[model samples]
Target: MMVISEKVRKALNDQLNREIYSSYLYLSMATYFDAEGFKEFAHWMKKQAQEELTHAMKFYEYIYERGGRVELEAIEKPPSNWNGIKDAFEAALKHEEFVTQSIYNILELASEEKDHATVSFLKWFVDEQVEEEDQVREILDLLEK
Candidate 1:
């Protein structure tokens, strides 16, 4: 009766929240960076924020494509301030680690459910997390030096 198993669907819903929260968190950094006079850094933050939104929409579309009802969850608040540029980027790296794991967990459940479609759909996300973490770490390395 279910196009996607309840466990997989729930995992997708939870990930959707994580992705949007990531977007929201970056927006917070964008604003804080702007207020701190790092306008260029703020722009970078804003761009990443939009990218996260794009990621969220992909999840939303995939849910409907799989005949699953998309449910919205409350987004928790992200920090409004950071100590400095380096500190903010460090926080970003840490958060992306969490997001990477979140995507992996969904992929895990989908594989167990034998939901081949969901598994394929998540392949892009899996690669994305790898590249995303790599790129963020590159930025962190620059900041650390």
Candidate 2:
């Protein structure tokens, strides 16, 4: 028996999909930078993409580990347009903010369900959101300098 409702389980699966999509988006940013001759920036974004993929996989594993079935969802293609490094990173910041909010909402749902184990499992993501946002914010600040 699953502790979480089917709805919540599905929502988590959807988030996993989004996180995987984020990885592709960051990879696209990396490629965009590489094409524009920003080798170092490309490397950084590529590494970020790898991290995002790992985050997604963590969610993927958690669902199954918690006895919930994992459902794979479709990921839309990432946008190809970016103004430059600043614009790309600004977009990244916005994306991170969106993801953070999503994670917060999920945590709220878990709490509402009285699912302490799920809540505890989500603590890492709560901390991760902070790091993700700060990293993007710092980069944006540097880009402005």
Candidate 3:
């Protein structure tokens, strides 16, 4: 029936993969902060990891709702070692920037395909990306001084 085009499905799947990787990355960072004795930062990263999981689930459910196959791919390993507190949060900020770009690319593709459903479905992520960066930046800024 072509509820969603193959390209759109693939884009959703790729986003799911990215979200999963983000969860993994933040969890790893959480553990790193825990071992480093930054209890607050550790909990913050854990919360961020949880948020990413919910983000992944949205992409997962959307794939099935759109009558597309869901593919759970292997997540890439995140570094366990960070130079220091400042370095770790900096990496987080950088990662959020990368995520913002990823979501924008998906929106662009959906826009190009004129898939209104995918386009509409992606608006949440667009808002989320901004919220994500703001949170990371707030914490990072606080920690620096």
Candidate 4:
């Protein structure tokens, strides 16, 4: 069994919370889009929500696999309304950046503790965040045009 440090465990738990919150945020955006008569946008947001949940589960399973207990925290409420599609996409871009930073912080912590397994697991997230950020930015650019 792999041993995990308390600090790294706590950080991973926190990241799970963030991922859950991201899912909630996207769900809220999906509802907002649905109410605003943007069915396609709502579908896209719903897919994003599903993706975030997948991310959370990845962390959840990793924690357990590493012989660490999963500790879940309450997620903050997300905004239910937006000014426009552009505004919503802009918010998504910002949220992706936030998640990217959070992942980087976790990677730093894992590296400091010499947790090679966790670090390797998080490398996938690091690359994923770049793709996520790029996709959001592309949507924002399309919205701007």
Candidate 5:
């Protein structure tokens, strides 16, 4: 039997898929912002998109490395609506929060399973989630303050 259950593996794969989609979404946002004369912010979002794609590929490779079958699912199309710069960033912050919660839930499951390897592997993700939330929160604070 595989160390990780099929269901868990599939859920992980789904999250990976979402991350890939996030990359495209952010890239699209970057392009929109760039065209609107927000060069620095656009650059930042473009870099962020690259980072998100890297994260998704990390998950993809990790699954295979762990001898799990990665079943890729379709990523839903991203919304294309930006009322303003702040609006787009607010949306991005919300998305990061949601992703952080998902990572936490997955870690909880790993803990429940006593899957040490999986849990250990997830530590990096947990740290990454912290960074993501903090970065978004800082931006939101700057926006509000």
Candidate 6:
């Protein structure tokens, strides 16, 4: 078993928290869409929520596989209301931006610590963040038009 460094362990745990928060945020959006009678939009949000939960689980499993203890932090409550679908998409875009930065910060830390395995592991997230941000941007663009 690879011994995970404290810094890497903490960062991974923080990422888990963020991913869970993303799931919560998307679920809140799904509820908003359902209340507004946009069933299709609600379905989309529900799928997004599930994807975020998967991401959280990936991190959870990785920490354990690397011989690190998993420490689950409390996730913050997500907003339950938005001005409109556009507003929600805009918020999602902003959230994706934050997530992208967080992934980059982790990558940087892994690099500085000479943790090649972690760097490699985080590369998938770096790529995923690009896709996540792009998708949100596209949605925002369509919403703006």
Best by lDDT: 4
> Pairing residues by index, what is the TM-score of model 2?
0.95
lDDT of 4 by residue, 1-145 (tens): 5499989989999999999999999999999999999999999999999999999999999999988998788888899999988899999999999999999999999998888999999999999999998998888877777
How well is each residue in 1-145 modelled by candidate 5, as lDDT tens digits? 3668776687678779878888988888897788899899889889999999999998888788777877667767776669887788888988888887887787888788887877787789889988987887787788777
As for candidate 6, its clashing pairs are none
TM-score of each: 0.96, 0.95, 0.96, 0.97, 0.91, 0.96
Query: What are the root-mean-square deviations of the candidates from the true structure over C-alphas?
Result: 1.1, 1.0, 1.0, 1.0, 1.6, 1.0
Off by over 4 Å in 3: none
Positional deviation of 14 in candidate 6, in angstroms?
0.6
Question: Model-by-model lDDT, in order?
Answer: 0.90, 0.88, 0.90, 0.93, 0.82, 0.92
lDDT of residue 122 for candidate 4: 97
* Model 6 lDDT at residue 23: 93
Candidate 1 local Cα displacement, residue 111, angstroms: 0.9
Candidate 6, residue 131: how far the Cα is off, in Å: 0.5
TM-score, prediction 1:
0.96
Error of 1 at 60 (Å): 0.2
How do the residues 15-120 of candidate 2 rate in per-residue lDDT, one tens digit apiece?
8998998999999898889999999988998998999989999998888887898777777889876987799989999999999899888889988988887789
TM for candidate 3 is 0.96
The candidate that achieves the highest TM-score relative to the unseen native structure: 4
Stretches of candidate 4 exceeding 4 Å from the true structure: none
lDDT of 6: 0.92
lDDT of 6 by residue, 10-128 (tens): 99999999999999999999999999999998999999999999999999999999998877788788999999999988888899899989989999999999998899999999999
Off by over 4 Å in 2: none
> Which parts of model 6 are misplaced by more than 4 Å?
none
Clashing pairs in 4: none
Across 13-38, the per-residue lDDT of candidate 3 in tens digits comes to: 99899999999999999999999898
